[PDB]
Design a protein around this ligand. Structure first.
Ligand SMILES: [Mg+2]
Ligand SMILES: [Zn+2]
Lengths: 90, 56, 333, 697, 83, 225, 296, 231
RNA sequence: AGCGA
């Protein structure tokens, strides 16, 4: 009787798989530029979180431009129609 | 039974098991060579018949 | 207890009578528990013994096989059915055919030998048929199908993947528990007897057997007996040295009288003898017959139906290896 | 139950330190040597792997200062049975010769017939002339224990079933009503007031004040005394222990009197169950092979119901990262479920809880772990705090519910005795009112146990000609082959006691009733009766009582002299073509309830060194698919199911999650990998410098 | 053959299935492999069309693939080769 | 052939129980009619009962009230024997106050309109000088048996005390038959049925409601064309 | 039924949690899998109607320790049952060595298609009737059902409504044109179930001797008619056996029933054997109720 | 809370299987047995009560001039479907001379009475035999035994027989446990009604329902304004 | 360590 509290949850694995699928879907619902900016901002493509200067460099624009992009995209995402399919994942 | 002696003398002889029995395929979790495990039945090729395939 | 109890449970027992009944009640219950442990253990051992008997081939295509008693003859003359046929004959395949009085064939080679066909044989008036068994199946690794006969579960011919060894294991070791031994005390018969017989442990109550035919040289020595066999060729007289008077002489057909002609391996006293000795005398055939008859004797005594083919699988597993008395010149100690 | 409380004391155990364990405690010591008579009951002993090792002391037995067991005896001098009670050990028992209590004593100490039953030294039984007898038993039922002595008509039952009945009489549960049994022994009052769980008026006096909590007794000399009750206290097996008073404010009580009934007690005497109308006919197969059918009346009128109290506990302790806190500021959870919690964690008293609900809002530090990008962006969008303190609140476990009786909270701030590194200890007591449900275990007082096959509606039950439905239906086939017709005699005598009798001694006394005690020639309905175990109702007396069983309300003798009655099938309607036995039988609810047994697991905790699923209903765990079950599967030849059960349900660590993924996605199940115990085995063998390797061909 | 109509788990009649194949173990593998083919067909319907085909007999409202495969067997709609 | 249709006569024995006689009946039928009616009366006569209570001094069911001899669960078991008849279907509330010593009979309950208690003489509890019992009882219509509805399922507060409810006004039903069966084959059955209600509704009303109920489930089979 | 078994829903809902989760996600009852899982946990009532759909046609295994022999594990089709106790078919009690004194069983669950096929075909109840040891039936009716069938097929001389050929003043008053007429006369208090009468049957096969007498070679039953002097109970008893089976006309001792079931299993298909044994069970219980076997 | 239904599975021309579902646990047993008894003993019908035969006075073994024996003729006539309207016992005659097979159409009925299976074998005659038998038929209910002759010898040739007045022959039933979860274990009634070819099982069941609804409206008409179970 | 089958 030594329960393995740190172990496979056996449900959160598939839960996170479906989570990631849903996030890729939602990001495809939005503009491609917005989706790529969010992916680089939050490290969804390689696990390396890119910051405003790096993303502004790779898009050839300024960090305040991308901050405006990020704010508008996150405001778009807070709109429930884009969030009804994600609310239950917490 | 007599586990220590059996293991040691097997080790000296380098006696290689062939896993041809049943309890061994139970121990290593592979399909047992009885019932639906023997190759006469475990390697059945199943295909829809050509006539009904065309009819489909 | 020589009192004995003299009140029915309707009448209600008295204090002492009830106190006496308690002895047997508790004894029986404790024996039940211990014997359950023992029977589970026996099944455990047997399963490993017979783990590698699995039907591989459809037909080994041999011609050897055992004969079955199958309704021995009546003195006045009829076909009185042998009571234990369902366990010894049914679900078997014939290697030979049934012919009688130079007549026509009755049942051909390789038939399931069910109720209608046995009825036909008994109507035609034959007593012995030579039938296949798993003892003489000539396949290398495990029995063929036709040797194992009808699968007792399906009612059809056994399949070509069945683990008949473990099936026989469970069938033999399952009906333990309800296996109370003989009521008699030095007499030995019960689950211990079954266990010793399979274990091949020389039965503690060895009953000396014969070694060659001829009449008997019987004598009652000092406080115990002295028997000897008069050979027929002859040769050296096997003189049985000490034969305690705590035994009995074998009664058959009459009691064993002096000068009576004995068989090659006739049991002299009444009891049991070592399967080793009956082997070295009368060969693999006699030992297999002896083992099956003995074990089935106990299971019959408790009125339990077990087809003999399971026991036959187990004894076939028993009689595999041979012993090296001369190395020849190759690799055998 | 109070009887079990008594019987666990007085228990004799031959296994112990300086004792014979079951390894060495073979059959030889498990028999009943004839010296046990009057010193150790031959009946009671656990039915498990301890038969004879654990027994119980006789009723009248006493302990020699030297650790031997003395027994009382009535000495008899020159055939005159004195009253000088001398206590003898087994040695003197063997020396002298012992007669029987149930002998014709001719009202003067003098035996009647010269040839008298007697016991000799070696357990022998003889007919000695009535001159050499020097000792005679104090009474019958001297060789029997306490619990067993409460079985009516014991002498009719076989030893095996009587032993079962004795072992199950200790397993009853305290019901909410606890009605006394109709037919009993003498050992329901004495074994009740000596059990301890009944309040006893210490010294005589009058009653001043009663309540549901305390009783104040005014002693005849000035002093008052308050007996405090024990209401709804949890026992050691989660059963209620309510104590309720039976006196009135104006009553006078005397010393040694019962003053407040305990858990299974009624007006002083033991009440381990209820008196139910019983029929003995097999009904529609539902009462097949020891199954039992009850009426919906028991469910409705709450006849069989048990209060059960469970104890849950949690400790706010110290840790490396900081200190754990019981509070309300739990991480992500809707405020909907925080309605029950009080301002400071623990739930409010009385709030009904279901499986998985919160009981103690408790949170513990988790330090700093970098988040997965997905949950990081989820927090970015939903504006949720990291809540570095992970949450391990006390959630009521699966498949349990009920009310919250009490909340016992400790604290370090109160300077209470807590183990090191513990800040605040709290326990919550949940309680439920489990009603009788199919699958529960019921039993009579004769070892006639059985689960409940089905609870029919009240209308589809065989009812008498008077419209009274029977309450339970036993099976006939279990009676003859088990040799416990004690239940049948109990049923008949219970019906007699329920209806009330009147032996019309118009012309003297009938033949059967000659040696009946006075004030048994008539009785009232629902009149309680007792038959001591070995001197009790004779068969002729029972026939005589059943003969006259005065009618209920109209002129209707429902049960004829035979003891049967014409039942009407409640379901179809036609009368049954043959009369059926009916009566009142006392039955008890056993502590093997379905709710405490049903168990399931889809995926739960896992073992540590081996990666097998855990074990026990305390956890989820699974069922050990043991070696014989493996053999059964091989004999069937079900190789794929064997593979599944031994690889991708127990130990294939990377295969379990893949199987779950496939099941949820609707894909196919993947092929098993390799068992984990096998890899462990390989690693130990290689650690033993044994080169184990797998070779392809 | 005048049996009463089966229902649930026992349709079709196993004895009328055993005449199709050599032994019940062949029957088992036959049905299981067909059921796996059916499951793969239902999973791989969203994307392009590949070698898999079925169900060949019309299924029920919500029917399990193994049941579909056994009914196909009883209908004599496939064949197999042993090992 | 008998062309006379059956009748139904009555026999009052006491205020609460009475006998009903039906004749003639075609032979081999009285047992069936008696059983059908019995299963009706003793299962599905609509009634009313107390559903939940709320004692001010308690928070739950397994506690005690200061002053009263009995405990809360014993009180529950006692009130479960109450017999009450409502008129409207909305769940109504009746109150009960008592102070000081004395027995607490059902007659002390003050009911609202429509509802009535049919036995004031039931012992509920007994008090003393320190006693004070104040409790409300929810009374509701319904039929058959229902266990205690869950507190969490409803939006009730912590003071709620649910109670299992038995909506049934009938206490005991039986019957017998006197089949004449004269050899001349003018045979007929005579159903003599006996009802005993628990002083809630008259046996006449109970049987009338049962007869009404045994028109619906056979209107099912009747309405075909 | 023989191939069926009970299952407490509050257990199955946990056993088949992934299946019901998937299905009630599919029916749009849950936005996603985690919400569906919480729905199952809280047991919102529609979970049960989806649970039925997942349960249908998906066998389970019933282990009982100690598993002495091969039939300790058998595969049943589960069906949902009110309560918390597994409802087991009474006729596998012999195989399981299970009396209902409080014994417990373990429900397993095959997952892969291969496992489901193995349980369906090899380990199904109706496909394992006989012993592996001696081939005798273990689905054979026992105990109470045997008592019922004995009381049903036993013959009582001097019973109500016998066949007597007395003439001169009145006819025999024993003949009965059809078992339907006989059943009606039994419902009326004229015919006892164990009286000797002469019925005229048209849906039962006569024994070999009467067949060879009246039809000689090829008497088919479904249309042919023939009289028989038997008891009503035995006619009702031969109604359960299949059509091809001859008439029996004996007293159903346990050994006789064993012989009948053995013959039936050796000559007829397994499904027929299963259906006839189920019918025998039902009749045995129904007429064990009426036998009036009590102990006083 | 739910409306039960009724649907039939027509198996033969006259053999049906009704299903009523779902009910309140337990109403299936409340109404199935009552329905069975109504079907078997409440639908009016008609049958033969007795018969007298020429050439037979006391030799009740066999009839001269024919092949079949008296009891065989009796139990062949016993299974004879007939419909009538005249309540008094009416007399029919079936008479036929010559060798040949006597069918159910040979009988010539008077006004009102009718035979519903004329093409049914009854007897065989050989060697210029003439069989003439008189039937007395009347209508009734349920089943009656062979009524003993109330008169001793008023009709010396008149020998009584049974009378299967009931139209339906064989009705059984059983209950099931449909939908235990969301309905809390309701019941389902199955009926297996078999009738002769006089009436359909559908009309038989409808008439039985009519009789039962009248018989329970008898009880209903005590306090008409009585609340019960309503659907 | 205790207990049920
Ligand atoms: Mg048991
Ligand atoms: Zn061979």
């Amino acid at each position: 009787f030594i329960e393995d509290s740190e172990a496979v949850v056996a449900v959160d694995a598939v839960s996170f798989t479906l989570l990631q699928d849903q996030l890729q879907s939602v990001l495809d619902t939005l503009s491609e530029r917005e989706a790529g900016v969010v992916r680089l901002r939050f490290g969804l493509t390689d696990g390396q979180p890119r910051t405003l200067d790096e993303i502004g460099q790779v898009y050839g624009v300024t960090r305040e431009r991308i901050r405006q992009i990020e704010s508008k995209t996150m405001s778009k995402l807070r709109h429930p129609s884009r969030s009804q399919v994600l609310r239950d994942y917490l | 039974q007599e586990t220590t002696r059996v293991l040691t003398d097997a080790a000296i002889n380098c006696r290689s098991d062939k896993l041809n029995g049943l309890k061994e395929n139970v121990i290593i979790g592979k399909l047992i060579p009885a019932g639906t495990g023997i190759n006469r039945y475990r390697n059945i090729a199943v295909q829809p018949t050509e006539e009904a395939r065309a009819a489909a | 207890i020589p009192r004995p109890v003299k009140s029915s449970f309707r009448e209600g027992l008295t204090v002492l009578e009830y106190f006496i009944n308690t002895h047997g009640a508790r004894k029986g219950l404790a024996d039940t528990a211990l014997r359950t442990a023992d029977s589970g253990y026996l099944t455990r051992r047997l399963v490993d013994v017979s783990q590698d008997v699995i039907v591989r081939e459809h037909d080994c295509q041999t011609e050897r096989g055992i004969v079955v008693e199958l309704a021995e003859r009546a003195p006045d003359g009829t076909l009185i059915r042998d009571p234990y046929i369902e366990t010894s004959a049914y679900a078997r395949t014939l290697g030979t055919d049934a012919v009688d009085e130079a007549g026509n064939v009755i049942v051909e080679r390789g038939q399931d030998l069910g109720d209608p066909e046995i009825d036909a044989l008994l109507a035609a008036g034959i007593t012995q048929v030579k039938v296949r068994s798993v003892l003489t199946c000539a396949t290398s690794t495990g029995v063929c199908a036709t040797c194992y006969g009808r699968s007792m579960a399906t009612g059809k011919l056994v399949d070509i993947g069945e683990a008949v060894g473990i099936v026989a294991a469970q069938s033999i070791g399952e009906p333990g528990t309800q296996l109370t031994m003989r009521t008699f005390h030095d007499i030995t018969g019960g689950l211990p007897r079954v266990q010793e017989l399979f274990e091949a442990r020389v039965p503690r109550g060895k009953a000396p057997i014969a070694d060659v035919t001829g009449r008997v040289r019987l004598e009652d020595g000092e406080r115990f007996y002295k028997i000897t066999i008069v050979p027929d060729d002859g040769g050296e007289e096997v003189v049985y040295d000490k034969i305690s008077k705590r035994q009995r002489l074998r009664v058959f057909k009459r009691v064993l009288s002096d000068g009576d002609h004995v068989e090659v391996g006739q049991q002299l006293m009444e009891g049991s003898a070592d399967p080793h000795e009956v082997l070295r005398v009368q060969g693999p055939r006699e030992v297999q017959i002896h083992l099956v008859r003995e074990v089935q004797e106990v299971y019959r005594a408790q009125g339990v139906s077990i087809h003999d083919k399971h026991i036959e699988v187990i004894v076939r597993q028993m009689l595999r290896r041979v012993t090296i008395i001369d190395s020849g010149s190759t690799e055998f100690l | 139950n109070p009887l079990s409380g008594l019987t666990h004391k007085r228990r004799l155990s031959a296994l112990g330190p300086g004792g014979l364990s079951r390894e060495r405690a073979g059959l030889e010591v498990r028999d009943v040597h004839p010296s046990h008579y009057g010193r150790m009951c031959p009946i009671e002993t656990p039915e498990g792997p301890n038969i004879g090792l654990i027994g119980s002391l006789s009723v009248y037995a006493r302990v020699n200062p030297f650790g031997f067991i003395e027994t009382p005896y009535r000495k008899v001098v020159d055939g005159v049975v004195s009253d000088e009670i001398v206590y003898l050990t087994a040695d003197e028992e063997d020396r002298h010769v012992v007669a029987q209590a149930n002998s014709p004593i001719d009202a003067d100490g003098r035996f009647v017939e010269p040839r008298v039953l007697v016991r000799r030294k070696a357990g022998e039984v003889e007919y000695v002339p009535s001159s050499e007898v020097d000792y005679m038993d104090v009474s019958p039922r001297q060789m029997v224990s306490v619990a067993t002595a409460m079985i009516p008509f014991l002498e009719h039952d076989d030893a095996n079933r009587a032993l079962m009945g004795a072992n199950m009489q200790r397993q009853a549960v305290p019901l909410v009503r606890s009605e006394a049994p109709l037919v009993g022994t003498g050992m329901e009052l004495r074994a009740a007031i000596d059990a301890g769980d009944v309040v006893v008026a210490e010294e005589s006096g009058v009653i001043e004040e009663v309540s549901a909590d305390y009783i104040t007794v005014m002693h005849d000399n000035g002093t008052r005394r308050t007996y405090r009750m024990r209401k709804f206290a949890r026992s050691n097996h989660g059963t209620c222990a309510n104590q309720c008073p039976i006196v009135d404010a104006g009553d006078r009580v005397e010393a040694g009197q019962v003053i407040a009934d305990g858990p299974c007690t009624d007006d002083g005497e033991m009440a381990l169950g209820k008196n139910l109308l019983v029929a003995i006919m097999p009904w529609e197969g539902h009462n097949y092979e020891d199954a039992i059918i009850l009426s919906n009346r028991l469910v409705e009128e709450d006849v069989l119901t048990s209060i059960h109290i469970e104890e849950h506990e949690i400790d706010a302790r110290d840790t490396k990262l900081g200190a754990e806190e019981i509070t309300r500021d739990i991480p992500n959870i809707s405020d909907e479920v925080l309605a029950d919690l009080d301002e400071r964690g623990i739930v409010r008293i009385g709030a009904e809880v279901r499986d998985g609900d919160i009981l103690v809002g408790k949170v513990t530090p988790k330090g700093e772990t970098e988040l997965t990008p997905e949950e990081r962006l989820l927090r970015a969008i939903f504006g949720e705090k990291a809540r570095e303190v992970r949450d391990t609140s006390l959630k009521v476990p699966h498949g349990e519910s009920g009310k919250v009786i009490g909340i016992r909270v400790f604290s370090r701030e109160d300077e209470d005795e807590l183990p090191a590194g513990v800040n605040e200890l709290v326990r919550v007591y949940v309680a439920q009112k489990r009603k009788i449900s199919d699958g529960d275990k019921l039993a009579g007082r004769h070892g006639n146990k059985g689960v409940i096959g089905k609870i029919l509606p009240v209308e589809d039950m065989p009812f008498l000609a008077d419209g009274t439905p029977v309450d339970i239906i036993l099976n006939t086939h279990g009676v003859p082959r088990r040799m416990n017709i004690g239940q049948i005699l109990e049923t008949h005598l219970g019906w007699c006691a329920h209806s009330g009798w009147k032996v019309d001694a118009a012309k003297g006394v009938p033949d059967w009733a000659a040696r009946l005690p006075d004030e048994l020639l008539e009785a009232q309905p629902n009149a309680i009766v007792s038959t001591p175990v070995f001197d009790g109702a004779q068969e002729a007396e029972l026939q005589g009582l059943l003969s006259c069983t005065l009618p209920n309300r109209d002129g209707d003798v429902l049960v004829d002299a035979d003891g049967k009655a014409m039942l009407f099938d409640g379901r179809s309607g036609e009368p049954f073509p043959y009369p059926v036995t009916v009566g009142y039988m006392y039955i008890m609810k056993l502590h093997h309830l379905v709710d405490d047994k049903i168990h399931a697991r889809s995926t739960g905790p896992y073992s540590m060194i081996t990666q097998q699923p855990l074990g026990g209903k305390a956890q989820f765990g699974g069922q050990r698919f043991g070696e014989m079950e493996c053999w059964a599967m091989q004999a069937y030849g079900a190789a794929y199911t064997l593979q599944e059960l031994l690889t991708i349900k127990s130990d294939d660590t990377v295969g379990r999650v893949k199987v779950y993924e496939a099941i949820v996605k609707g894909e196919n199940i993947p092929e098993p990998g390799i068992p984990e115990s096998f890899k462990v085995l390989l690693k130990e063998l290689q650690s033993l410098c044994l080169n184990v390797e797998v070779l392809s061909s | 053959g005048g049996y009463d109509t089966p229902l649930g788990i026992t349709n079709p009649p196993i004895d009328e299935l055993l005449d199709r194949v050599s032994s019940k173990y062949a029957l088992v593998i036959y049905a299981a492999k067909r059921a796996r083919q059916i499951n793969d067909y239902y999973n791989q319907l969203g994307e392009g069309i590949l070698e898999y085909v079925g169900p060949l007999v019309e299924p029920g409202l919500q029917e399990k693939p193994l049941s579909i495969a056994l009914r196909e067997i009883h209908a004599d709609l496939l064949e197999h080769t042993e090992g | 052939l008998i062309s006379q249709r059956p009748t139904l006569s009555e026999d009052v024995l006491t205020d609460n129980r009475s006998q009903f006689v039906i004749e003639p009946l075609e032979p081999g039928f009285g047992y069936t009619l008696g059983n059908s009616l019995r299963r009706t009366l003793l299962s599905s006569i609509p009634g009313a009962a107390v559903t939940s209570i709320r004692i001010d001094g308690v928070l739950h069911e397994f506690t005690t009230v200061p002053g009263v001899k009995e405990d809360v669960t014993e009180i529950i078991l006692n009130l479960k024997s109450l017999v009450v008849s409502s008129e409207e279907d909305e769940p109504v509330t009746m109150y009960l106050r008592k102070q000081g010593p004395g027995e607490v009979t059902a007659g002390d309950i003050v009911p609202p309109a429509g509802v009535t208690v049919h036995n004031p003489g039931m012992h509920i509890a007994t008090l003393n000088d320190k006693g004070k019992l104040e409790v409300e009882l929810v009374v509701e219509r319904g039929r058959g048996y229902v266990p205690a509805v869950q507190n969490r399922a409803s939006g009730a507060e912590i003071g709620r005390i649910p109670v299992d409810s038995i909506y049934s006004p009938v206490l005991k039903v039986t019957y017998k038959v006197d089949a004449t069966r004269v050899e001349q084959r003018t045979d007929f059955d005579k159903l003599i049925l006996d009802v005993e209600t628990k002083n809630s509704i008259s046996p006449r009303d109970a049987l009338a409601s049962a007869g009404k109920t045994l028109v619906e489930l056979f209107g099912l089979a009747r309405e075909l064309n | 039924k023989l191939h069926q078994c009970g299952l407490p829903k509050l257990m199955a809902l946990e056993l088949f949690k992934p299946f019901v989760m998937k299905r009630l996600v599919d029916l749009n009852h849950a936005q996603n899998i985690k919400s569906a899982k919480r729905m199952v946990e809280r047991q919102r009532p529609q979970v049960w109607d989806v649970l039925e759909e997942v349960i249908a046609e998906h066998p389970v295994l019933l282990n009982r320790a100690p598993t002495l022999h091969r039939l300790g594990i058998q595969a049943f089709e589960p069906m949902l049952v009110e309560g918390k106790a597994i409802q087991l078919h009474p006729l596998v009690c012999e195989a399981f060595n299970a009396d209902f004194d409080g014994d417990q069983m373990a429900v397993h669950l095959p997952l892969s298609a291969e496992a489901q096929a193995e349980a369906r075909i090899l380990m199904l109840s109706s496909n394992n009737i006989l012993s592996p040891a001696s081939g005798r039936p273990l689905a054979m009716p026992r105990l109470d059902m045997v008592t019922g069938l004995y009381y049903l097929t036993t013959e009582v001389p001097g019973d109500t409504g016998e066949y007597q050929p007395a003439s001169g003043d009145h006819p025999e008053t024993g003949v009965y044109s059809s078992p339907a007429e006989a059943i009606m006369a039994a419902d009326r208090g004229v015919l006892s179930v164990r009286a000797k009468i002469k019925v005229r049957l048209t849906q039962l096969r006569p024994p070999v001797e009467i067949e060879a007498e009246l039809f000689g070679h090829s008497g088919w039953q479904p249309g042919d008619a023939w009289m028989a002097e038997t008891t009503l109970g035995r006619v009702m008893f031969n109604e359960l056996l299949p059509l091809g089976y001859p008439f029996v006309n004996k007293q159903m001792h346990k050994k006789v029933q064993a012989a009948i079931i053995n013959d039936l299993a050796e000559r007829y298909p397994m499904i027929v054997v299963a259906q006839t044994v189920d019918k025998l069970k039902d009749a045995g219980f129904y007429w064990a109720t009426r036998s009036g076997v009590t102990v006083s």
